[PDB]
Design a protein around this nucleic acid. Structure first.
Ligand SMILES: [K+]
Ligand SMILES: [K+]
Ligand SMILES: [K+]
Ligand SMILES: [K+]
Ligand SMILES: [K+]
Ligand SMILES: [K+]
Ligand SMILES: [K+]
Ligand SMILES: [K+]
Ligand SMILES: [K+]
Ligand SMILES: [K+]
Ligand SMILES: [Mg+2]
Ligand SMILES: [Mg+2]
Ligand SMILES: [Mg+2]
Ligand SMILES: [Mg+2]
Ligand SMILES: [Mg+2]
Ligand SMILES: [Mg+2]
Ligand SMILES: [Mg+2]
Ligand SMILES: [Mg+2]
Ligand SMILES: [Mg+2]
Ligand SMILES: [Mg+2]
Ligand SMILES: [Mg+2]
Ligand SMILES: [Mg+2]
Ligand SMILES: [Mg+2]
Ligand SMILES: [Mg+2]
Ligand code: NA
Ligand code: NA
Lengths: 89, 272
RNA sequence: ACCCUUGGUCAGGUUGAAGGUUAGGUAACACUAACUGGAGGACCGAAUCGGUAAGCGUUGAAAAGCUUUCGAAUGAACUG
RNA sequence: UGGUGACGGAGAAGCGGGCUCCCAA
RNA sequence: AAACCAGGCCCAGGCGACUGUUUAACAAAAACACAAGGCUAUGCAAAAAAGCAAUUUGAGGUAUAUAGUCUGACACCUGCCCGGUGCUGGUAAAAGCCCCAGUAAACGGCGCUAAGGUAGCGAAAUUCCUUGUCGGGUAAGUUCCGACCUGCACGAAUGGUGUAACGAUCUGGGCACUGUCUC
RNA sequence: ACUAUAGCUUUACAUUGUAUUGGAUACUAACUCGCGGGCGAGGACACUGUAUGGUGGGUAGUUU
RNA sequence: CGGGCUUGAGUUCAGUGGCGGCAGGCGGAAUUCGUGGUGUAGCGGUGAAAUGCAUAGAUAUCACGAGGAACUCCGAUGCGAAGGCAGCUUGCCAUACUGCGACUGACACUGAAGCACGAAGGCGUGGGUAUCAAACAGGAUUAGAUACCCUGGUAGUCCACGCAGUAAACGAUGAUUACUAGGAGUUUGCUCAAGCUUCACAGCGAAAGCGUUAAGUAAUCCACCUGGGGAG
RNA sequence: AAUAGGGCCUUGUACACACCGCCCGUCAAGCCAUGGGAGUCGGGGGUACCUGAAGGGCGGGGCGCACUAGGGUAACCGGUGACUGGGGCUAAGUCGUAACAAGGUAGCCGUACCGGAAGGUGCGGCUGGAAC
């Protein structure tokens, strides 16, 4: 991905309390979703980047684990974040 | 790209046709088409000199610009088009002066591109340059043999040649057949290979498609009588002896190039 | 007999390819479901083209036919 | 000097034709 | 189903993939074609085909193209031989010929030669002897099906062996049904 | 099978000329081809005529 | 079940990497073929020979033209989940290690089914085809040689896409966490911490041996074994 | 007169009456168990259809439900069959020598091709190998 410091700071500012919220849910989720989208667009052109494919699968698992933690915590934040980003497919 | 037909019919089980993915227009330019009259392989005396020709779909002729004379005037690619007369696709060019033309569409040519001809033209795809201006090692098609006569050499779908070295007033070109030969530096060629390289993958599937394409069935010589063919005759199946034509021309190794032709001085290596 | 140019014809019924849409499913493809769609030297069968089998005819109605049966019938079709 | 003339096949739809699709263009 | 109209069905083989074509007037087929595969020629006034020629076809096509020839969908495959015959090479006022080299999806061969038949089939559209022998079906089977292998005289692109679907093809057995027959 | 022969092919002469260290090279002017309505590419080769040697069931007349 | 905490886990930032993956370009040596100079009695091979190439002109040697494959020295070390990864350069990715006085708050471990990757050889379609080389052919040795040696030689070896899912795929040693002695080297980050390999306390073991990278002490989950053939 | 094999070490071993060792495979012989096949003969249950007792139900009859009986297709469980292929054990008759030592071409794993037979060769991997 581009993964610029500006892009990361903007993502954190949009998702979570203040820019400094770098390591919270609903922001790790957004970062993982952005990276997953960029990795899908990269794998569309590079069909033999199996290491990148494996890393994408690991990122998907990480996002699933964070979503499960949100499940254990409540359901309103779960519904809000999936409605915002677009998850279930 | 090609499309395979599902085996709902015995005449469709083995059919593979093109996908027509690069074609952008369905009807031809009216000012560049004329009705075409078919020969049944018959010459001006009315006697058939070439066999297995006749019938097929009615066709119109597209005037293809094989000379590329308008040097320095840029042209834009309008449409990619089907041509019933040749294996490759054609491309409609609009010039800045209002002239319209057809060229053989190279691989990787899209609608909206700009092409040029002449010594000033850049060595990009679709441009037509004299061979003295084409950097050594590039892929070319539509190669002239004499300056100003028009493209004759590399024209079929997918085919290409390579300019491998230049020696004075001549250049060395490797041909699709594997021949290596000298061509004058004043002759023109178009950069790139011919498009529609998937033409060779198509399978007709049935006899009717050959009938549509305008071919008539071919009879083997061994199943004729001796009065019709040297290989004919016998009771039961017989091998026919050494294979040869109706006039007895040997068909398994006899060379037929004239062995005094002046063009042999311009051939470096032979493969035909 | 074959070819060239220019015209015309093919009742009715059946089957249900590509494709499309909407569901689920995917990281995206993939991949299942329903409806739609109407392809094919596809099927049954008149006109029509052809001529399988049997019977009749053999100074015949006819110098090659008739009756019944049978093949093809959107195509490598038939026809002016 | 430029346009019309000018053109395929199959199928929806309108006693009491546009149109859709297809390739063989 | 009310008349007229209006599929007989099943089991098992040979051949050819299939739809098509053919001996007008005794042969519709297993013959021809076919989609597809191989080899060979051809660099463009192409090779090739008609024509005395001019000229035309090829084709206004350019090696993913054209022409000659054999095989003939598809699946698994396609063995050994260049000795012989073809083919490619290195006299009038030099070609050839010899010799040597290559070529078998060239013709052809596969019993002391050049090499001695690989896989797969086999009493076969090929087996004379012959109604070969064993089994199955019948009360009884010179035909049919399955095996056996002294294959008179199979054999791998004049292709070998299979193969779903298809056939007014050839061939064997059942059910239905009946003046084919007892008559 | 015998004898011819169309076609293909070899060389000599003609078309057909000029220079240099003869048989090679080179030249352009005969001759051939392309473009435009002279220029480019070849070139004494190629093509064609006469003669000559090969090949020639493609074709013909015959014999057996 | 309802709250807290930061030590585990993760996110951010900075520094340090790297034969990690994919893709596009660039290279010299050697070697193969074709065409031409010089030149002529052999070359090649072996334990010894022969089959083979060569006076209708070899080996060698000087050039021009057309190509394919592999990356000497560095080079033993490093990276990757494993299989594996080595000419030069660029682009796009992934990932690791160390730390912060930045964040969130147990979000963790393992994992039957499933999914993905997975050496070589092999299969299908299209390219290409220099070397080597199964099968095949010839020459030798042997009683024989269906081999070992020599000369040829087709698939394959190379590229793209798709199948296939195997290995002494081995450290013959599953993953995670915590703890427990010393010597000899080595790489990176700076005397310290990661990693990399051999002698070696306690302990373990049938022994060979392992020994902070355990085969020691303990806890969690998964996989597997129950005499040898028959028989994967 | 003329003329200049045996011990001591280190190693590997599938041998131990000890290399004159031990073992591998093929073909021919004899017993036993289990495979595959044109076909042929049975048994138990099942879905449909056609008939259908007694006893009750509804409407002296009529119509229901199912115990059977009948045909046919489908399963499963079983026998037999022209012919055709593994394995075990006992004999060991024949043919070679593949492995155990660097076993006389180091061995083994995967894979492909090819051979009377153990096997040979090509490509990659391992040391459960020498020797350098
Ligand atoms: K034919
Ligand atoms: K003849
Ligand atoms: K009529
Ligand atoms: K028969
Ligand atoms: K055949
Ligand atoms: K053969
Ligand atoms: K130790
Ligand atoms: K041995
Ligand atoms: K050995
Ligand atoms: K390994
Ligand atoms: Mg005939
Ligand atoms: Mg015959
Ligand atoms: Mg039809
Ligand atoms: Mg009719
Ligand atoms: Mg019909
Ligand atoms: Mg037929
Ligand atoms: Mg027919
Ligand atoms: Mg007739
Ligand atoms: Mg008839
Ligand atoms: Mg044939
Ligand atoms: Mg009979
Ligand atoms: Mg004659
Ligand atoms: Mg006479
Ligand atoms: Mg014996
Ligand atoms: Na013969
Ligand atoms: Na009947």
């Amino acid at each position: 991905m581009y993964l610029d410091s500006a892009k990361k700071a903007e993502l954190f500012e949009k998702y979570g309390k203040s820019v400094k919220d770098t390591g919270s849910p609903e922001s790790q989720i957004a970062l993982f979703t952005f990276r997953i989208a960029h990795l899908t667009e990269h794998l569309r052109q590079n069909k033999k980047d199996f290491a990148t494919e494996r890393s994408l699968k690991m990122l998907v698992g990480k996002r699933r684990r964070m979503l499960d933690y949100l499940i254990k915590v409540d359901i309103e934040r779960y519904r809000a974040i999936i409605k915002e980003l677009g998850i279930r497919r | 790209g090609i499309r395979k037909l599902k085996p709902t019919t015995p005449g469709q089980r083995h059919k593979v046709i093109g996908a027509f993915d690069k074609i952008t227009a369905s009807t031809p330019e009216k000012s560049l088409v004329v009705g075409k009259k078919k020969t049944g392989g018959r010459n001006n005396t009315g006697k058939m000199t070439m066999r297995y020709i006749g019938g097929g779909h009615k066709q119109k002729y597209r005037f293809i610009d094989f000379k590329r004379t308008k040097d320095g005037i840029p042209a834009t690619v309008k449409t990619i088009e089907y041509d019933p007369n040749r294996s490759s696709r054609i491309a409609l060019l609009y010039y800045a002066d209002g002239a319209k033309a057809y060229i053989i569409a190279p691989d990787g040519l899209e609608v909206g591109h700009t092409v040029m001809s002449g010594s000033e033209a850049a060595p990009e795809v679709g441009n037509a340059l004299p061979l003295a201006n084409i950097p050594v090692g590039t892929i070319i098609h539509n190669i002239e043999l004499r300056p100003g006569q028009g493209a004759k050499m590399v024209r079929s779908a997918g085919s290409f040649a390579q300019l491998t070295s230049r020696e004075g007033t001549y250049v060395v070109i490797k041909m699709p057949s594997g021949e290596v030969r000298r061509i004058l530096s004043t002759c023109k060629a178009t950069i790139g290979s011919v498009g529609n390289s998937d033409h060779a993958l198509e399978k007709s599937g049935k006899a009717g498609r050959s009938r549509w394409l305008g071919r008539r069935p071919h009879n083997r010589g061994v199943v004729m009588n001796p009065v019709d063919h040297p290989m004919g005759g016998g009771e039961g199946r017989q091998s026919g002896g050494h294979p040869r034509s109706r006039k007895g021309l040997y068909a398994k190794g006899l060379k037929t190039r004239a062995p005094k032709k002046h063009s042999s001085k311009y051939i470096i290596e032979r493969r035909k």
